[PDB]
Structure 1
Amino acid sequence: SGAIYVGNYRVVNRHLATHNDWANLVWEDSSRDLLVSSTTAQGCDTIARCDCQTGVYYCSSRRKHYPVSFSKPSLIFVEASEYYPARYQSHLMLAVGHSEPGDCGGILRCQHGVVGIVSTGGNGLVGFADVRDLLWLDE
């Protein structure tokens, strides 16, 4: 689990969105595994606006942060799970590192701020849903 709080927005993995997230929906995209809902309280996470390919992510299944090199956001095939059939997930970045399904929502950050959240993995590869292109999160 995990979310990003920026301004009057909350960003979460779409497959983990709650009834309240859907009742206050701003935007969702199944192909990216993202959903953004509105909040009353003001969030103060900073979103990175860059093309970094190195950063640190939080791994709840190890209670540890790990530095990684990651690919640029791209369309990657993702095997079926109980939340989606087999499909291409867009805006996804992979890195070599540990993750388990419950690790979704862990944040990946570079020196410029939040880059994305854990969304896929397996076979020693962790995948992050990018949020750097959602410029509207800052207004």
Structure 2
Amino acid sequence: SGAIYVGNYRVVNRHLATHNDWANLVWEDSSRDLLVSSTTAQGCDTIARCDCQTGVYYCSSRRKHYPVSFSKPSLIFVEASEYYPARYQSHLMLAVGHSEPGDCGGILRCQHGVVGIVSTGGNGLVGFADVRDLLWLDEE
């Protein structure tokens, strides 16, 4: 579990969105496993606007924050899971590291702010959905 709170927006994994997130939907993309909903209170997170390939992510299944090198956002084949059939997931970055399904929502951050959230994993890899291209998260 986990979310990014920036301005009046809440960014969550699309598969973990609640009834309130869908009722207050701003934007969602099944191919990215992302959903953004509106909030009444202002958030304090800052989204990174950079091309960083090193950062730290939180892994709840180990209660640990791991420093990682990650690939640039790409279209990657992702095996079938409890929430999606086998498909290509877009804007996805991979790192070598631990992840389990319940780790989705864990933040990946670099020196510039939030880069993305855990979305995939398996075989000693962890994948993160990028949010740095969603420039509109910074305004209105």
TM-score tier, shorter chain, comes to: over 0.9
Task: Name the SS of the counterpart of 1:31 in structure 2.
Answer: coil
Rounded Cα–Cα distance in structure 1 between residues aligned with 2:103 and 2:87: 20
Task: Name the SS of the counterpart of 1:133 in structure 2.
Answer: coil
Structure 1 residue 44: deviation in Å?
1.1
Structure 1 residue 23: deviation in Å?
0.4
Partner of residue 9, structure 2: 9
Task: Name the SS of the counterpart of 1:32 in structure 2.
Answer: coil
Q: Deviations over 1:15-59 (max 9, x none)?
A: 000000000000000000000000000001000000000000000
Structure 1 residue 82: deviation in Å?
1.7
Rounded Cα–Cα distance in structure 2 between residues aligned with 1:13 and 1:137: 16
- Percent of aligned pairs sharing the same letter: 100
* TM-score, normalization by structure 2: 0.99
Q: How many residues align?
A: 139
Task: Name the SS of the counterpart of 2:12 in structure 1.
Answer: strand
Is 1:31 the counterpart of 2:31? The answer is yes
Q: Deviations over 1:97-135 (max 9, x none)?
A: 000000000000000000000000000000000000000
Unpaired segments ≥5 residues, structure 1? none
Which 4+ runs in 1 deviate beyond 3 A? none
Unpaired segments ≥5 residues, structure 2? none
